[PDB]
């Protein structure tokens, strides 16, 4: 009855955005990388250089992207102690 929603797959092929970032469409109709809106909540805990434990790989880098800081995974699973 009404027009069915358009996709960004076309504008966002084949775009590479790092971990914690994904591809979206600017007001000019062209692809950018921005911080990921919501990470898929797979349970895959991870420990950051910042000493924090994150739910998964995406969440660690998404946080890095929101804060403009330098977080990386140093080891997987929860942080020590």
């Amino acid at each position: 009855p009404w027009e069915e929603p358009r996709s960004k797959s076309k504008i966002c092929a084949n775009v590479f955005c790092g971990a914690g970032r994904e591809c979206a469409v600017t007001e000019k109709g062209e692809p950018t990388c921005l911080c990921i809106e919501q990470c898929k909540p797979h349970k895959r805990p991870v420990c950051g250089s910042n000493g924090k434990t994150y739910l998964n790989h995406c969440e660690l880098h998404r946080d890095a992207c929101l804060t403009g800081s330098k977080i990386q995974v140093d080891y997987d699973g929860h942080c020590k102690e």
Copy 2:
């Protein structure tokens, strides 16, 4: 047990993005407007200058934003005929 996800509300207050656009965070940690990822699927049909019928106000402008074209609502409800 793990750190709970951060929000963009802080970076995106108080940002104004037009219809069909919303606010997200760039790789530099600052707010932009980009095309809305998914419009809330409220049923509020609308007819565009482009002669197409859209599910709602957001969907018409989101399409405008993805195509870089000049769509506006000329009247609400489905298009004629």
